[PDB]
Amino acid sequence: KQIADSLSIPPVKAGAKQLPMPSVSGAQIKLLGADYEQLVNSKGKIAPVISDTPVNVSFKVTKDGKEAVSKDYEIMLQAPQAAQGNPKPRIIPEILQWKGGQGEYKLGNTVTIACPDKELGKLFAADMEDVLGKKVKLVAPGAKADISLSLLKGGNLGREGYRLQIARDGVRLGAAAPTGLFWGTRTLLQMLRQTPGSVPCGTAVDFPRYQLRGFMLDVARTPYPLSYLKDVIRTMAWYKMNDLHLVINNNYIFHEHYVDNGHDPFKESYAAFRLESKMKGKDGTPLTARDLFYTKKEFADLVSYARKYGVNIVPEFDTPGHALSFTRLRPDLIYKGPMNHEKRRCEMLDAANPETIDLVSKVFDEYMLKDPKLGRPVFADCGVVHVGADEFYGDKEDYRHFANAVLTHALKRGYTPRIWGSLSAKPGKTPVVSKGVQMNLWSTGWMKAWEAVNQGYDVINTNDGALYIVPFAGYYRMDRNHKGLYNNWIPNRIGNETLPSGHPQLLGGTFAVWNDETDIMHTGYAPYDIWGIISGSMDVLSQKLWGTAKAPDTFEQHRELVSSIGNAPRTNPLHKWKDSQPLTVKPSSLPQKLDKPALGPNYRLTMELELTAAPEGKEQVLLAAPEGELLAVMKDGTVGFRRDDSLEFSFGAKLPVGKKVKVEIVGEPEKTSLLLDGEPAGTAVLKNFSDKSKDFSDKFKHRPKVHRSTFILPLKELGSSFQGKVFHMNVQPL
Numbered sequence: 221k222q223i224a225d226s227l228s229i230p231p232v233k234a235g236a237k238q239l240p241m242p243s244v245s246g247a248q249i250k251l252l253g254a255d256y257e258q259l260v261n262s263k264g265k266i267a268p269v270i271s272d273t274p275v276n277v278s279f280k281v282t283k284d285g286k287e288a289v290s291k292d293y294e295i296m297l298q299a300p301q302a303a304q305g306n307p308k309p310r311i312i313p314e315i316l317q318w319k320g321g322q323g324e325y326k327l328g329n330t331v332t333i334a335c336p337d338k339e340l341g342k343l344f345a346a347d348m349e350d351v352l353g354k355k356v357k358l359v360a361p362g363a364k365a366d367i368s369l370s371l372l373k374g375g376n377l378g379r380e381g382y383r384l385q386i387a388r389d390g391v392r393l394g395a396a397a398p399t400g401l402f403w404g405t406r407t408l409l410q411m412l413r414q415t416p417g418s419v420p421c422g423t424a425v426d427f428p429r430y431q432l433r434g435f436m437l438d439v440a441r442t443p444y445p446l447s448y449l450k451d452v453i454r455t456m457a458w459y460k461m462n463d464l465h466l467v468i469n470n471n472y473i474f475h476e477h478y479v480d481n482g483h484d485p486f487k488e489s490y491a492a493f494r495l496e497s498k499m500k501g502k503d504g505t506p507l508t509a510r511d512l513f514y515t516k517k518e519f520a521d522l523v524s525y526a527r528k529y530g531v532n533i534v535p536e537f538d539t540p541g542h543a544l545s546f547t548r549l550r551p552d553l554i555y556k557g558p559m560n561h562e563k564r565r566c567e568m569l570d571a572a573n574p575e576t577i578d579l580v581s582k583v584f585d586e587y588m589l590k591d592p593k594l595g596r597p598v599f600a601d602c603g604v605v606h607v608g609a610d611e612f613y614g615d616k617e618d619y620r621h622f623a624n625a626v627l628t629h630a631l632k633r634g635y636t637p638r639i640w641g642s643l644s645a646k647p648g649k650t651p652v653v654s655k656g657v658q659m660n661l662w663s664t665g666w667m668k669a670w671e672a673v674n675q676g677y678d679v680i681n682t683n684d685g686a687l688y689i690v691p692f693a694g695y696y697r698m699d700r701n702h703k704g705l706y707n708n709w710i711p712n713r714i715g716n717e718t719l720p721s722g723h724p725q726l727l728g729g730t731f732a733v734w735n736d737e738t739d740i741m742h743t744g745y746a747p748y749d750i751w752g753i754i755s756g757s758m759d760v761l762s763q764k765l766w767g768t769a770k771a772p773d774t775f776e777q778h779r780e781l782v783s784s785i786g787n788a789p790r791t792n793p794l795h796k797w798k799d800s801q802p803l804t805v806k807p808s809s810l811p812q813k814l815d816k817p818a819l820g821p822n823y824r825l826t827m828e829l830e831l832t833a834a835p836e837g838k839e840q841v842l843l844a845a846p847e848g849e850l851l852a853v854m855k856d857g858t859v860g861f862r863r864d865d866s867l868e869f870s871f872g873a874k875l876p877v878g879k880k881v882k883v884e885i886v887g888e889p890e891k892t893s894l895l896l897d898g899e900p901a902g903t904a905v906l907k908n909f910s911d912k913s914k915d916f917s918d919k920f921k922h923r924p925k926v927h928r929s930t931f932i933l934p935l936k937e938l939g940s941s942f943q944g945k946v947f948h949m950n951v952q953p954l
């Protein structure tokens with residue numbers, strides 16, 4: 221142990237093909253690993269590089285019968301001398317290796333692409349057409365082509381690496397595997413976004429330092445439509461991130477708010493399970509969420525779509541904590557033992573009870589075993605399934621029994637389980653399986669990194685202090701620390717612990733958006749409202765997950781480059797129009813088809829209309845599209861709207877019946893305002909949850925501090941169910 225502690229790694233000869241092993245007579249020393257396994261394999265063989273590249277190596281020392289691992293030692297692999305030529309193109313994430321060439325390759329008026337993968341070819345070509353505004357055509361593999369993609373045999377590129385060579389006779393993108401081909405297309409498209417007319421000659425060789433480069437989204441505590449998730453997928457792939465963890469069930473955190481204000485959280489707290497399910501509780505209430513859910517076909521197709529983009533989707537069912545969706549099915553299976561946070565008992569499943577593992581395993585089997593309609597499991601393309609198991613505040617040995625059981629069930633079904641690390645705060649003698657188990661290291665206090673590694677888990681840096689975002693909250697504000705993360709964050713530093721970067725049990729890292737301030741705390745923020753902080757986090761963390769331990773530029777230069785490269789191809793997350801030209805419609809009869817794209821802020825909608833009948837309790841839709849509905853009359857008679865995340869908002873004002881009126885709706889980020897005849901009629905307020913807390917006194921301190929009300933303007937159909945006349949309509953992007 222002392223040997224590894226004080227090992228001395230000398231400089232590597234320029235061009236050496238084998239790493240010299242350190243020698244100490246008392247013990248045995250072997251390579252623990254290199255952060256770039258592609259450059260130094262487990263046996264110490266060093267692959268050639270085309271530009272100087274740093275590699276961190278670390279060693280396992282065995283003295284007597286004791287083992288110990290060293291710290292990281294940085295070595296510098298040196299390329300042979302060259303004329304250097306063109307500078308390295310600036311990409312996010314950075315291209316690892318580059319040898320510049322001479323001149324440019326000029327793109328023609330039309331572009332041809334040779335691709336052995338038909339699906340990749342079609343996707344790449346449509347992305348190219350969107351980025352270039354030119355016609356792109358797929359030709360036969362092996363035929364003359366401007367851009368030729370091929371699979372290479374042998375080599376060190378692995379599943380995700382690629383070699384991109386640009387010469388005067390065209391572009392050649394080679395990869396050991398189609399995933400590397402896809403990443404190479406991402407690189408080429410980012411290049412063409414900066415200079416669409418030509419690309420610098422030279423050779424890039426590129427591959428990731430970490431194989432798991434992930435994002436976790438809490439889609440349980442507030443809803444997200446599939447369209448937003450597809451934006452997320454394409455933008456992750458744009459920055460070469462590849463692991464999307466979706467929280468399928470969970471519930472409002474602060475049950476004590478209900479308890480302390482005289483209400484039962486078991487009856488009142490928001491809870492959601494987001495997949496279509498046959499499961500129904502004792503009272504007959506379904507497991508599947510009512511406000512928004514994904515069908516089994518929708519989820520399987522979403523997984524396959526993400527796979528097209530090189531992204532693995534990981535679904536999480538969270539038990540035995542955070543399981544109010546399950547205890548509502550089986551209230552007899554509520555945990556009855558001692559616990560911290562006793563007012564949150566209603567979400568705790570009876571971990572030691574055999575009927576609990578029966579229920580949970582049945583739910584898992586609905587998606588892990590063959591589905592009769594799909595002819596295959598809903599999770600057939602999910603190699604990893606997350607079994608949750610965070611923050612169970614009850615008995616340690618009960619918890620360990622249950623966690624072992626659910627992990628074992630996933631493994632027996634042929635899936636790789638991922639779990640929230642909880643075994644430092646829940647130690648015990650009940651064995652918890654570790655072989656083949658992945659683990660999010662989210663809290664040092666719940667699970668020490670070195671303890672997790674020594675117990676045999678494959679670990680993912682998910683540390684709450686560095687990587688957690690709770691939107692618009694007073695804590696976990698990683699969205700405010702993007703510069704610090706860019707300059708300082710590395711995947712192998714996990715809180716106050718540092719693993720060697722080449723440790724074989726370190727898979728990479730994941731950042732997380734947790735929607736704590738929801739239900740009766742919900743300010744009405746939309747998915748749109750966090751897009752900037754999500755994308756921004758990606759454009760920083762992608763660099764540190766794919767690239768080296770040092771940022772290639774300053775944070776400010778990085779964000780300049782982010783702006784120059786732009787959004788993912790065929791992705792319009794802020795719902796902007798191509799040009800700021802207004803839309804004017806004189807309607808002839810209602811309903812009237814508009815077939816215009818939805819419009820995000822900022823905008824002004826102006827209408828001259830007359831509501832001619834308002835039957836009580838009847839909803840009247842004035843504008844509609846998949847993105848939402850503008851309701852001239854809601855069930856309570858007011859003007860309002862409903863978004864594609866199912867959240868409903870009211871302006872608190874009513875249209876007059878039988879009177880011409882000028883309606884103006886002004887959409888800004890987090891605020892939509894209504895004016896009637898030029899007079900401020902109101903600002904929209906979220907309606908979904910406030911009725912539960914309406915009669916709480918001011919001893920309750922957690923009302924929404926701001927009323928947010930973003931509205932993506934729907935413009936597919938006018939007057940779907942409007943009982944009135946529309947004389948004039950104008951939509952002005954601002």
Ligand SMILES: CC(=O)N[C@@H]1[C@@H](O)[C@H](O)[C@@H](CO)O[C@H]1O
Binds near residue numbers: 696734
């Ligand atoms: C594994 C995990 O993160 N568990 C909880 C999570 O449910 C919560 O929403 C988030 C932010 O407060 O952090 C923890 O308290």
Ligand SMILES: [Cl-]
Binds near residue numbers: 230231295296297
């Ligand atoms: Cl060196």
Ligand SMILES: [Cl-]
Binds near residue numbers: 697700
């Ligand atoms: Cl802060």
Ligand SMILES: [Cl-]
Binds near residue numbers: 746747749865932
């Ligand atoms: Cl949205």
Ligand SMILES: [Mg+2]
Binds near residue numbers: 793847
């Ligand atoms: Mg949208």
Ligand SMILES: [Mg+2]
Binds near residue numbers: 430722723724
């Ligand atoms: Mg590694």
